[PDB]
Design a protein around this ligand. Structure first.
Ligand code: HEM
Ligand code: HEM
Lengths: 458, 458
């Protein structure tokens, strides 16, 4: 019941009073983000709460965040919180722990270099043209457009060609065997898990694998079909080939190959589609920002020139818009590390087993570091003001050795979509648009209502 | 079902074919020991089997046993197999893992030194006189005596005075609050656990603590009564004081104090009582050995002189009888270590998670190292033949940093009992005696029938 619920009281750490068994999970009715901002406002820099029987310690001090994410990563704070039923996804880089994660991290790090990203921008740019082609149709209909569907179709077209080389227009091909099996996904079982963590091993013995054995065998058989058709018949630049070439520490196995590719699919579809919808909402509700970005894009790229890797990294106002949107909407919301052993960081005793949490959403809106946090102001990230941003308060991609390994890929992917879309269209709020935007009440950072806007042709 | 049952087939390791879910647990119908000897005879030096879904690898090569128990103890083979419902006994030295065990081992190692054992032999010898006093009564009745009851009463009298200083004659005091609460213990739930390991965390949330909350609070309140009555009112030589003094790495906590004392109670009652019964069986069925031991005891100790610490370690034939009995009856039966990470020891790939097992019982009776293993021959351990015994085939107390920390205490305790008993009595087989002795069919090394013998007065 209250087995470990007296931990934070024994250490003198404040926090909301936990209920037996449940802990503080009932305080999630307002959302992960609202619960973090209220605890930050009512407890100061450090507080604690319980996800069931699991004690969670939240820290907001910049030096402690640097100590947890960077200084004591390999020694104390290496792994993340486990785990609903895992299956074979234990070999996933974002799920692996300790030395197995370090092996996968070092094996997949050369894949996400800027040199390998630069070789992927011709393929990613191809579907930017496909994106505006499906947007040209939905704009000429003369009625609001749900940005979740055109960005989700674009985000999948990028992740299928970059991870496997499969080149399909998803929006106009409702069912290419590959598209549908990738669409087979995916509350309130997640809160049941956090309050019944002892029932997780039972879902392993009942062979209740979280992923359908049909799609799993598909991707596993689709990959082995690709590995066999390419060895040898008879130069490719996808994530699969970059991992196949690395197989010739110890090399990755064939099942480990499937595990990482499933990660990138989950990593690209949810995030890039949601962040692009957040950006277009801010661009539509701030037409002055949208015009200045279009004026910059027209300058570096004359007469709608095709965006390239070097021309994307030259646009400063584009990078300022992406960073300011990621401040208001950090899709990860939280950063988490498990304390492997008893440690003393910056004057605090952190006992073993406690989950250290970085409230990234609450830090991005804390009035102590941000002037008028609720407003979309891209000028915070200009070269004049960029210096005075603490890189441990603003952590949209995390920090330390276990930060987002696909940060460069995600930034390049979203910018290539924003450029081609803004070169052809302008976006204004319609009457179905939710103004102001409300966040989802669930456990995902997504708009409560799908973003609908007007789309004109330039 | 057969999730990891194909592990030993992938590594080319022989072993009995496992059944789905059950594995090889049905082969335990003949006993842990018979199953190890059959697998040793039918597979050679190395084989594998499954306790449910848990793969177990047995090794019999001396160099590999030394590598697992000594060379790669801290690095690879540090912890033992876990764990039915634990409760607060996670702080037990024999259950603790990794650095927490090393902390408890170094904190309790100075307690089991020969200097501290030498200061305990006057108190242990007091109950040797109590042992012969209760044996003088049960011998004058002129009928067979169950050695389990007089040795169990003696073994408890030693463990209560050495661990807490409580001085009570257990046999004639049926219920001293302390005696009974120590007698509140304790199949087929153990095999249910090995086949349902996922149900162990459920016994933790149901507050089904394996130890009754009544006796547990008793010992916890009995210890705090002793710690408070001794601090200060107002020189003691028990295990509790040796651990109380060590509290003034990091010092042991009050709950950690109770955990280790519970270990010593379980460690002393079952073993010393059972081994003494095994010794007296061999002494009775080999009267030539019993006479030569009594002739040696009468030499060093004239006219039944009181045995002392120095006089015990002088008796060679007494040490030869104890060692030969521990060969035929190693009460631990098996030595186990968990492989923490992928390692390559002496030409073998040991994957992570595999339990490495040392069949101590089967090694002590292997005809390759022992001539006529089934016969009780103390001359194997004479100074002439003692050199040619491999210390990794004969491992009655284990080996390496995690061997039996109470080996010296157990050897001194049993010898002090054997001396005082053999100084006064002789032992012959009666008609109720099970000849030849059969081992228990269960999961404990104890006689199938309780050892009953004739007891005469000298
Ligand atoms: C807007 C897009 C994205 C954002 C904002 C984002 C953000 C994050 C954050 C905050 C973390 C956790 C960092 C930490 O715990 O310190 C993370 C982890 C990770 N991300 Fe991303 N991510 C994005 C897209 C992607 C993409 C497209 C990929 C791959 C194709 C990717 C791959 C990963 C991986 C593998 C990890 C775990 C790294 C590890 O455990 O070593 N992410 N991401
Ligand atoms: C005839 C009596 C005894 C025998 C044959 C015996 C044998 C053993 C064996 C074989 C092990 C495992 C070694 C390994 O895994 O390598 C062990 C462990 C242990 N024994 Fe004994 N034992 C006896 C009595 C005792 C007594 C009386 C005590 C304490 C009062 C004791 C305390 C321990 C402890 C604490 C461990 C675990 C050590 C650790 O995990 O670090 N034993 N014993």
């Amino acid at each position: 019941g209250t087995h470990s619920h007296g931990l934070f009281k024994k250490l003198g750490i404040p926090g909301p009073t936990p209920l037996p068994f449940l802990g503080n999970i009932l305080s999630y009715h307002k959302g992960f983000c609202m619960f973090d901002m209220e605890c930050h406002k009512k407890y100061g820099k450090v507080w604690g709460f319980y996800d069931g029987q699991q004690p969670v310690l939240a820290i907001t001090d910049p030096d402690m965040i640097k100590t947890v994410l960077v200084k004591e990563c390999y020694s104390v704070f290496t792994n993340r919180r486990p785990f609903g039923p895992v299956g074979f996804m234990k070999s996933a880089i974002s799920i692996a722990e300790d030395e197995e994660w370090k092996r996968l991290r070092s094996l997949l790090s050369p894949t996400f270099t800027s040199g390998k990203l630069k070789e992927m921008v011709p393929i990613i740019a191809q579907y930017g043209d496909v994106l505006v082609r499906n947007l040209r149709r939905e704009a000429e209909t003369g009625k609001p457009v749900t940005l979740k569907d055109v960005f989700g179709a674009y985000s999948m077209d990028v992740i299928t060609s970059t991870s496997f080389g499969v080149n399909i227009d998803s929006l106009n091909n409702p069912q290419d065997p590959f598209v549908e099996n990738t669409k087979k996904l995916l509350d309130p079982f997640f809160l049941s898990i956090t309050v019944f963590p002892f029932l997780i091993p039972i879902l392993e013995v009942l062979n209740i694998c979280v992923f359908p054995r049909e799609v799993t065998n598909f991707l596993r058989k689709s990959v082995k079909r690709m590995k066999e058709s390419r060895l040898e018949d008879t130069h490719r630049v996808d994530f699969l080939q970059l991992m196949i070439d690395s197989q010739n520490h110890k090399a990755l196995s064939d099942l480990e190959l499937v595990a990482q590719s499933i990660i990138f699919i989950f990593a690209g579809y949810e995030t890039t589609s949601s962040v692009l919808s957040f950006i277009m909402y801010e661009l539509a509700t701030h037409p002055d920002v949208q015009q200045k970005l279009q004026e910059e894009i027209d300058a570096v790229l004359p007469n709608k020139a095709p965006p390239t890797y070097d021309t994307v990294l030259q646009m400063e106002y584009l990078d300022m818009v992406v960073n300011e949107t990621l401040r208001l909407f950090p899709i990860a919301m939280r950063l988490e590390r498990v304390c492997k052993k008893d440690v003393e960081i910056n004057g605090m005793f952190i006992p073993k087993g406690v989950v250290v949490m970085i409230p990234s959403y609450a830090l991005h809106r804390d009035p102590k570091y941000w002037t008028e946090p609720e407003k979309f102001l891209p000028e915070r990230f200009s070269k004049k003001n960029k210096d005075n941003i603490d890189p441990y308060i603003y952590t949209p991609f995390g920090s330390g050795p276990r930060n987002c390994i696909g940060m460069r890929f995600a930034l390049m992917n979203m910018k290539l979509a924003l450029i081609r879309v803004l070169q052809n269209f302008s976006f204004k709020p319609c009457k179905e648009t939710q103004i102001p935007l409300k966040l989802s009440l669930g456990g995902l950072l997504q708009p409560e209502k799908p973003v609908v806007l007007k789309v004109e042709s330039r």
